[PDB]
Design brief:
Elements (H helix, E strand, L loop, with lengths): L6 E5 L3 E4 L8 H6 L4 E4 L2 E5 L3 H13 L1 E2 L14 E4 L4 E9 L11 E5 L9 E8 L3 E5 L16 E8 L2 E5 L6 E8 L2
Antiparallel strand pairs: 1-2, 3-4, 5-6, 6-7, 7-13, 8-9, 8-13, 9-10, 10-11, 11-12
The structure holds glutathionylspermidine (TS5).
PDB class: hydrolase, ligase
Keywords: Gsp amidase, ATP-binding, Hydrolase, Ligase, Multifunctional enzyme, Nucleotide-binding
Assembly: monomeric
Amino acid sequence: DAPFGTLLGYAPGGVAIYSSDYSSLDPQEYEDDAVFRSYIDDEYMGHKWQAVEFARRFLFLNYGVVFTDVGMAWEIFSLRFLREVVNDNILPLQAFPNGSPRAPVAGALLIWDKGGEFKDTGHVAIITQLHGNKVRIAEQNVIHSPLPQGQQWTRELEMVVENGCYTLKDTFDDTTILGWMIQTE
Ligand SMILES: NCCCCNCCCNC(=O)CNC(=O)[C@H](CS)NC(=O)CCC(N)C(=O)O
């Protein structure tokens, strides 16, 4: 909806979300040129303006941590540590599959496996708010249109809480949510 790089709004903590609609520019030039590389004070955030770039920038700006570089977003679910940028300390990161008895929390990484709408890249978003039966998430490269005034999330997902288990339902019908990740030993 909005041209590539357009500010669409902000996620909690004042983290910018940009349109990543690269349907008007050279694809090869898109993956090779350094102008598509996002940084914050020499710290590499990711590729403009993919889902991984946003997730890493959000953690960096709000928690002072980052997860390692990955080729595909679904690979984040296999990571087991976060790195504290200020001193390079390593912190444990745990993965909780969808339907887990461990409830997600605000600020948690939500990972999608490759499949359906997220073909072979999968996806990653940040869970921003938890409610009775829904969670609000913030993400890049899904919504490319400006967000409503005061709205600091991109999508709302239904959350089913049954028999002590938490299951998130995506807005898409052909996708697969791997689960969420929280900083813990
Ligand atoms: N025409 C159909 C378009 C379908 C678009 N679906 C977008 C789904 C949103 N998910 C993503 O953006 C996840 N993208 C990715 O996983 C891409 C693969 S190039 N990987 C990265 O951005 C990571 C690059 C990296 N090395 C890093 O560490 O930051």
